[PDB]
Amino acid sequence: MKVAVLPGDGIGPEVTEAALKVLRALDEAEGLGLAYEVFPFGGAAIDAFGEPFPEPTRKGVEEAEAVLLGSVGGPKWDGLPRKIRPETGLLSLRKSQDLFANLRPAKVFPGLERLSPLKEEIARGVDVLIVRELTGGIYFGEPRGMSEAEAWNTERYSKPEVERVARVAFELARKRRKHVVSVDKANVLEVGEFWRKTVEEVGRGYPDVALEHQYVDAMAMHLVRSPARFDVVVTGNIFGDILSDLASVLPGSLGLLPSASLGRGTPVFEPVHGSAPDIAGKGIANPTAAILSAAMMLEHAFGLVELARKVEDAVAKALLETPPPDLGGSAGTEAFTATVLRHLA
Amino acid sequence: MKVAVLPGDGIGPEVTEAALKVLRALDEAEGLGLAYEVFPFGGAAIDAFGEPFPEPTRKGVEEAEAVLLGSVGGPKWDGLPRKIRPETGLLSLRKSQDLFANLRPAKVFPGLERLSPLKEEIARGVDVLIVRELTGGIYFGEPRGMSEAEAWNTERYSKPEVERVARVAFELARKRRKHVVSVDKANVLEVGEFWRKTVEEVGRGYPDVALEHQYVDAMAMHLVRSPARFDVVVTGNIFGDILSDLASVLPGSLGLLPSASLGRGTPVFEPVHGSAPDIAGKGIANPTAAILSAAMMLEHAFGLVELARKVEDAVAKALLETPPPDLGGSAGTEAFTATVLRHLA
C-alpha cells in the first residue's frame, strides 16, 4: 500500500506523525506492505518551492494509492496572492485528481455521549455519513456577478454530476446499513426535482438499498432531533456544506472529526481541523482526527475494513482512558497515541 | 382592533377558533375593542369562488389592521393547476400586501427546557428571532429551468430588497436586546458579498445595535452549540428556511411555532404547521402555534407587548399542565385552550 503523506503546516506534522506510528505498528504486526513518502504541501511547500502544490508533490500524489493529509494554512502566507495561497493548493489537489465526493462522518463513540450538545438518549448511536458533491453547484455556477445595484449566482447541476456522486453514496451505503437519504429542495426548485429524479434513476441499480428523499430545511431539523436513524446522506455542494457543519457538532468536539474526498483519482483523507499555529510544537495537539483519517484510508482506499474498525475501537478507548487536553484531559499527542497503541497490541 | 380572520383548510378552523377564544377573553377583560370577520381562503375559497384568494377576502385583508391566518392546503386540491392551488393564495396575499420580512421566533420557555433535544444547559435562555427575506432569492430567481441533461436556478438580490429587510431586523433588535447577526455566504458567493455590504451600510444608521456577520454553514453550528447568545438573525429566503426550521427543534417541536409576515400592507400572523387534513374535525389538534400567533399579533400589530407576554406565559403553563397528544398527553383542543384561558386571569 503506497501512501503519499502531505503533513502540511501547523499541528499538521504532529498529528500526521501520530497516525503514522499507528500505521507502522499495524504494518509490522501483520506485514501490510505499507510504503509511504512525505511531500511538501501548503505553507511548507511555498517556503521552498514558491507554490503550495509543486511538481514533486503532484507526481507523488499521482503514483500513490492514497493521500494522508495534515493541515494547511497559517498567517505567514495570508498575505500572498490568492493564486498561491495554501488553500489554493488544496483546491488544485482535488481538481488534479477529480475528487467529486466529500465524505464527512459524524458519530458519537459509546461512552462519549457526554460531550455531545444533545441529551444522552438522542446522541447515543449516532453514526451518520454525509456525502457532499464538491465540483458543482452555486459555488461554481455561471452566470454569476455583482453590480452596484444587484448580485446573482447560478445553482446549476448536470445529470453526470448528480449520477457520479449518487453512485458513491449507494456504494458506501451497501457496506454500511443500506440506507440512503437524498436531500434537496425539489418542492421549490428545478435543480431540486432534477436531483431527486436522477437519484431515483440511479437507485434502480441498488435494489438492496433503501432510498429516502428529504428537503434540506427538514433534514436540518431531523439531524438535531433524531440523528441516529440516518446512515448515508447524499446532497449537493452548498447543502452538503451546511449539513456537514451541522453534523460535526453532534460528537461534541472538532478534534475527533476525519474526512475523505473520493473521485476519479487518488483518494485524499484528512482531519477536518485547521492548522492551529499557536499550539503547534507544544505537543498538546489531539491526533484523533488524523488517526481516524488513517482508519478511513484503510477501509476506503485499501478495503481493510476489519483493521479500520480496530483502530476506531482503540481510539474510542484512548479517549475514555487518557483524554487529550481539549477533552478536559492532560494527555499530549505522544502519550495519547501510546494509549491507542496499547489497545492496538 | 380590526382583525381579518382566514381559518383556511384542515385544522386551520379549529386552531384559529382556539386563538379567537383567547382574544375574546382578553377583549372582555381589558376592553380592547376587538372586531373581526372571517373570510374564505385556500381550498375553502376554491370550493366557493374557484380561487384561493378571492376579491371579498382581498378587500377584507386590506381593510383590517392585521390578519389571523390558520392553515392552508389539502389533498383535495393538490391536482389543481398551480395558478389556483391553495398554496398560491399565500403568494398572492403576501404579494398583495407587500410583505417581505418573515418573523420566526424560537424561544425556550423557562421550565420547558426538558422538552428540548439539547442538553438543558444549552437550551436554557434561548430567545432568538430569525427574520427571513420573503420576496426574492433563488425561490423566485430568473432564469430557471431544467432539461434532460441539466437544471438551473438563480440566486439574485437587489439593493432595495436587502435594505428593507435589514432595516426591519435592526428595528426589531432595538426593541429587543440590541444585537443582530446577518447570515450570508460572502466567502464564496457574490450575493453573499453584496448582502453583507448592504446590511453593513444599513447598520450605520443604527449605532446602538451591535451587528455581527456569519456564514450560513457556521450559524448552523452556532445555533446548536450556543443558541442562547443570539438575538435577531437576519438572512435571505432559503437560508432563512433552513435556519428557522433548525431553530424550531430547540424549543422542542416545529408544530408549536408562530410566525408574522411584515411589510408595507396588513401584517399576517400564522402557524408554521400544516393543515393536517386527516386529523381535522376530531379535536386533538394542538392550537399552541395559533394562540402564539395571536400573541405575536398583539405585540407587533398593536403594540400590546405585556399582553403578548401574558398569553405566552399562559400557554407555557398549559403545555406543562395539560400537554396535548402531539406532546404525549391527552388534553385535546378544547381542554388545552381551557387551561390557557384558566391562566389568562
List the grid coordinates of B89: 393564495
Yes or no: say if B57 and B6 are a contact pair by the CB < 8 Å rule: yes
**Closest residue to A190, CB basis, from B146, B194, B241:** B146
Contact A117 B155 (CB under 8 A): no
List the grid coordinates of A163: 449520477
What is the rounded CA–CA span in Å between residue A309 and residue A194? 37
Q: Are strands A150-158 and A145-146 parallel, antiparallel or unpaired?
A: antiparallel
From B309, B323, B317, B306, select the one nearest B341 (Cα to Cα): B317
What B136-145 contacts at long range (C-beta under 8 Å, 24+ apart), as own/partner pairs, is B136/B161, B136/B236, B136/B237, B137/B236, B137/B237, B137/B238, B138/A138, B138/A155, B138/A189, B138/B237, B138/B238, B139/A188, B139/A189, B139/B237, B139/B238, B141/A152, B144/A189, B144/A190, B145/A190
Edge-to-edge, what's the strand order for the sheet holding B179-184?
A: B35-38, B2-8, B66-71, B268-271, B258-263, B99-107, B127-133, B232-235, B179-184, B210-215
* Stated resolution in angstroms: 2.3
H/E element, A8: strand A2-8
List the grid coordinates of A301: 482506499
**What are the b/e assignments for A189-219, b being 16+ CB within 10 Å?**
bbbbbbbbebbeebbeebeebebebbbbbbb
First-to-last alpha carbon distance for chain B, in angstroms, is 21
Beta bridge partners of B91: none
A76/chain B closest Cα distance in angstroms = 20
**Catalytic site residue A217?**
yes
Yes or no: say if B241 and A267 are a contact pair by the CB < 8 Å rule: no
DSSP code, position A256: G
Q: Write the single-letter amino acid at B280.
A: A
Side-chain-side CA neighbours of residue A307 (13 Å): 23
**Closest residue to A155, CB basis, from B116, B119, B138:** B138
Q: Write the single-letter amino acid at B201.
A: E
Beta bridge partners of A104: A130
Judging contacts by C-beta atoms under 8 Å, the chain B residues touching residue A245 are 217-218, 220-221
Contact B154 A153 (CB under 8 A): yes
Q: Which one of the listed residues B139, B178, B310, B313 is annotated catalytic?
A: B139
Q: Are strands A268-269 and B2-8 parallel, antiparallel or unpaired?
A: unpaired
What is the rounded CA–CA span in Å between residue B248 and residue B313? 19
**What are the b/e assignments for B313-324, b being 16+ CB within 10 Å?**
bbbbbbbeebbb
Yes or no: say if A25 and A291 are a contact pair by the CB < 8 Å rule: no
List the grid coordinates of B126: 434561548
From B249, B242, B236, select the one nearest B220 (Cα to Cα): B242
Beta bridge partners of B8: B71
List the grid coordinates of B85: 392551488
Yes or no: say if B15 and B285 are a contact pair by the CB < 8 Å rule: yes
Neighbours of A95 (CB within 10 A): 14
What is the rounded CA–CA span in Å between residue A3 and residue A174? 26
**Catalytic site residue B157?**
no
What is the rounded CA–CA span in Å between residue A73 and residue A154? 29
CATH class of A1-345: alpha beta
- Cell 432569492 identifies what position? B137
From A289, A246, A235, select the one nearest A102 (Cα to Cα): A235
What is the rounded CA–CA span in Å between residue A105 and residue A269? 12
Contact A246 B245 (CB under 8 A): no
Specify the 3-state DSSP secondary structure of A38.
strand
CB neighbour list of residue A50: distance below 8 Å, 6 or more residues apart: A84
Distances from the Cα of B72 to the Cαs of B245, B286, B325, in angstroms?
19, 16, 22
- Cell 386571569 identifies what position? B345
List the grid coordinates of A337: 497515541
From A15, A90, A82, select the one nearest A255 (Cα to Cα): A15
List the grid coordinates of A205: 441499480
Contact B221 A248 (CB under 8 A): yes
From B276, B304, B310, B278, select the one nearest B291 (Cα to Cα): B310
Q: Write the single-letter amino acid at B82.
A: R
A129/chain B closest Cα distance in angstroms = 17
Specify the 3-state DSSP secondary structure of A69.
strand
Q: Assign residue B111 a region (left: φ > 0; alpha: ψ between -120 and 50; beta: otherwise).
A: left
Specify the 3-state DSSP secondary structure of A41.
coil
What is the rounded CA–CA span in Å between residue A298 and residue B12? 55
Specify the 3-state DSSP secondary structure of A109.
coil
From A307, A246, A234, select the one nearest A34 (Cα to Cα): A307
Residue of chain B nearest A113, judged by CA positions: B119
Beta bridge partners of B150: A158
Neighbours of B81 (CB within 10 A): 7
Q: What is the dihedral of CA A225, A231, A237, A242, to 10 degrees?
A: 20
What is the rounded CA–CA span in Å between residue B178 and residue A49? 50
What is the rounded CA–CA span in Å between residue A284 and residue A1? 30
Yes or no: say if A217 and B245 are a contact pair by the CB < 8 Å rule: yes
CB neighbour list of residue B64: distance below 8 Å, 6 or more residues apart: B2, B3, B4, B36, B37, B266
Q: Assign residue B81 a region (left: φ > 0; alpha: ψ between -120 and 50; beta: otherwise).
A: beta
CB neighbour list of residue A317: distance below 8 Å, 6 or more residues apart: A339, A340, A343
Helix A12-30 / helix A333-344 crossing angle, nearest 10 deg: 20
Quote the Cα angle for B11-B103-A236, to 5°: 90
**Catalytic site residue B9?**
no
Yes or no: say if B251 and B107 are a contact pair by the CB < 8 Å rule: yes
A80 labeled binding residue: yes
Q: Write the single-letter amino acid at A300.
A: H
What is the rounded CA–CA span in Å between residue B233 and residue B217? 14
Helical segments of chain A, H only: 12-30, 43-49, 55-63, 86-97, 120-123, 159-175, 190-203, 216-225, 237-248, 288-302, 305-321, 333-344
> Between A and B, how many CB-CB pairs are < 8 A?
146
A46 labeled binding residue: no
Contact A221 B249 (CB under 8 A): yes
Yes or no: say if A57 and A72 are a contact pair by the CB < 8 Å rule: no
Residue ranges of domains in chain B: 1-345
**Closest residue to A151, CB basis, from B194, B248, B249:** B194
At residue B4, φ and ψ (nearest 5 deg) are -100, 120
Burial class (CB in 10 A: 0-12, 13-18, 19+), B87: middle
**Which residue of A217, A219, A223 is the best one to mutate when testing the B interface, meaning the one whose CB has the most B CBs within 10 A?**
A217
Q: Is the peptide bond before A40 cis (omega within 30 degrees of 0)?
A: no
What is the rounded CA–CA span in Å between residue B314 and residue B343? 5
What is the rounded CA–CA span in Å between residue B207 and residue B213? 16
**Catalytic site residue A36?**
no
- SS3 labels along chain B: CEEEEEEECCCHHHHHHHHHHHHHHHHHHHCCCCEEEECCCCHHHHHHHCCCCCHHHHHHHHHCCEEEEEECCCHHHCCCCHHHCHHHHHHHHHHHCCEEEEEEEEECCCCCHHHCCECHHHHCCCEEEEEEECCCCCCCCCCCEECCCEEEEEEEEEHHHHHHHHHHHHHHHHCCCCEEEEEECCCCCHHHHHHHHHHHHHHCCCCCCEEEEEEHHHHHHHHHHCHHHCCEEEECHHHHHHHHHHHHHCCCCHHHCEEEEEECCCCEEEECCCCCHHHCCCCCCCCHHHHHHHHHHHHHCCCCHHHHHHHHHHHHHHHHHCCCHHHCCCCCHHHHHHHHHHHCC
Specify the 3-state DSSP secondary structure of A242.
helix
A77 labeled binding residue: yes
Specify the 3-state DSSP secondary structure of A262.
strand
H/E element, A101: strand A101-107
Q: Which one of the listed residues A185, A215, A231, A310 is annotated catalytic?
A: A185
Q: Which one of the listed residues B27, B241, B313, B326 is annotated catalytic?
A: B241
What is the rounded CA–CA span in Å between residue B140 and residue A88? 34
**Which residue of A118, A155, A158, A241 is the best one to mutate when testing the B interface, meaning the one whose CB has the most B CBs within 10 A?**
A155
From B230, B242, B155, select the one nearest A242 (Cα to Cα): B242
List the grid coordinates of A52: 503550495
Burial class (CB in 10 A: 0-12, 13-18, 19+), B102: buried
**Catalytic site residue B139?**
yes
Neighbours of B142 (CB within 10 A): 9
CB neighbour list of residue A272: distance below 8 Å, 6 or more residues apart: A104, A248, A254, A257, A258, A259, A289
**Closest residue to A117, CB basis, from B118, B145, B242:** B118
Burial class (CB in 10 A: 0-12, 13-18, 19+), B157: buried
First-to-last alpha carbon distance for chain A, in angstroms, is 21
Judging contacts by C-beta atoms under 8 Å, the chain B residues touching residue A146 are 190-191, 193-194
- Cell 510544537 identifies what position? A281
H/E element, A184: strand A179-184
From B53, B74, B73, select the one nearest B4 (Cα to Cα): B53
**What one-character-per-residue DSSP string does A111-166 give?**
T-TTTSSB-HHHHTT-EEEEEEE-S-STTS-SS-EE-SSEEEEEEEEEHHHHHHHH
What is the rounded CA–CA span in Å between residue A139 and residue B187? 10
List the grid coordinates of B162: 436587502
Specify the 3-state DSSP secondary structure of A188.
coil
Distance from chain centroid for Cα A344: 23
- Cell 482512558 identifies what position? A321
What is the rounded CA–CA span in Å between residue B167 and residue B159? 12
